[PDB]
Amino acid sequence: TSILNLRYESNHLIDLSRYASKINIGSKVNFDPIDKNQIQLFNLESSKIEVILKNAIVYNSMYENFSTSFWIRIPKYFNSISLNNEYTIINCMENNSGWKVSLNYGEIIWTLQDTQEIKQRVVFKYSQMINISDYINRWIFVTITNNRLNNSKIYINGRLIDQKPISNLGNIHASNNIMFKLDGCRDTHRYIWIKYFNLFDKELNEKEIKDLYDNQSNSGILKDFWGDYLQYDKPYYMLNLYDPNKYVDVNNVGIRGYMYLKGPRGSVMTTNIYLNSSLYRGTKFIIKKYASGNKDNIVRNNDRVYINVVVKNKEYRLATNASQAGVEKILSALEIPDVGNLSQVVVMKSKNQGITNKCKMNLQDNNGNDIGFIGFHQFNNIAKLVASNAYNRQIRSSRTLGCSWEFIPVDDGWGERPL
């Protein structure tokens, strides 16, 4: 259905569509080594990608419908230089006609203009004054559809955000090429991550957009907070979606100690620019390889692993004694050499047979049996972390649960200073 399918095939970025439009990569374009489909464009002159569209698919019409989709990770806007400064990022305008995607402080703009100076804009806006943002510095799926008879629509993660009429626009003659480059951006350290760009010769419907969203999600691979693939041997600050205001801490190390959700999660801010909940708090978790010959360091849907915990700069092993009384098994931080026969094998999870689910850690005993998903339980006003089979069952519901976690690694797009 796509007339343009930009994907990193072999060792080059090409167009997997039947048209095979030529692609020129500037010398300052960065590709994520662990997932070369993710492209990083800096606010630097030669950090650009130009797509030369086959003359056959260049838009030039009064009634042809078309859409476009792609994922993007926009770093948090850090200071006043980014206020009121709309910069283009994907340009298909030629002689002031065609389309283009732009950004500005807290927004993603779509622009359509015909050859008679008649134009329309569709915008998505998100705030940087929020505890936990689904959008800031995280991979978002953007979809823009255009029905020449009535409206243009912008979707974010499969849901309709806004729509505007375009029926009054006459002939639109877009550009022969598409320029992916930060244009007119005043912030010298600005950049964006983008991947899976597509172009369609029709107005995608809600269902098609959803299937596009679910399929390009790679549901078989776990993701960290930013939406990147979850990795092994990579320290992560933990976030429990059920109770975001707290962070993981360790009472004491050892079998007679425990892990719990401590006091108030802080806030990070830059006056007049952003105010969000602190994300680099608590004892870090490191996913360790168990009985695996994993070449890459990517964590997949049913991988069996070990969870190391960092306490006062020393790594310990997450474990528990399942013989413990009660359904909820309280977890502890064990000296690695002394884990003995304690349960410690964790099955990572990204989906149920089933759909997405945030509960991603199912502890198993040494007999290959479920102890339960890792979450937390209230023990006399103390929220200790536990592995509970109760979670498994209630999962009959895809809502946020006590076992819904988020792994957050340090990222430059967030800008918070750790420790």
Curated annotation (Swiss-Prot):
<comment type="function">
    <text>Responsible for host epithelial cell transcytosis, host nerve cell targeting and translocation of botulinum neurotoxin A light chain (LC) into host cytosol. Composed of 3 subdomains; the translocation domain (TD), and N-terminus and C-terminus of the receptor-binding domain (RBD). The RBD is responsible for binding to host epithelial cells and transcytosis across them; this uses different receptors than those on nerve cells. RBD is also responsible for adherence of toxin to host nerve cell surface; HC alone prevents uptake of whole toxin by neural cells, and delays paralysis onset by 75%.</text>
</comment>
<protein>
    <recommendedName>
        <fullName>Botulinum neurotoxin A heavy chain</fullName>
    </recommendedName>
</protein>
<feature type="region of interest" description="N-terminus of receptor binding domain (N-RBD)">
    <location>
        <begin position="1"/>
        <end position="217"/>
    </location>
</feature>
<feature type="binding site">
    <location>
        <position position="328"/>
    </location>
    <ligand>
        <name>a ganglioside GT1b (d18:1(4E))</name>
    </ligand>
</feature>
<feature type="binding site">
    <location>
        <position position="242"/>
    </location>
    <ligand>
        <name>a ganglioside GT1b (d18:1(4E))</name>
    </ligand>
</feature>
<feature type="disulfide bond">
    <location>
        <begin position="359"/>
        <end position="403"/>
    </location>
</feature>
<feature type="region of interest" description="Interaction with host ganglioside GT1b">
    <location>
        <begin position="376"/>
        <end position="377"/>
    </location>
</feature>
<feature type="short sequence motif" description="Host ganglioside-binding motif; interacts with GT1b">
    <location>
        <begin position="388"/>
        <end position="391"/>
    </location>
</feature>
<feature type="region of interest" description="C-terminus of receptor binding domain (C-RBD)">
    <location>
        <begin position="218"/>
        <end position="419"/>
    </location>
</feature>
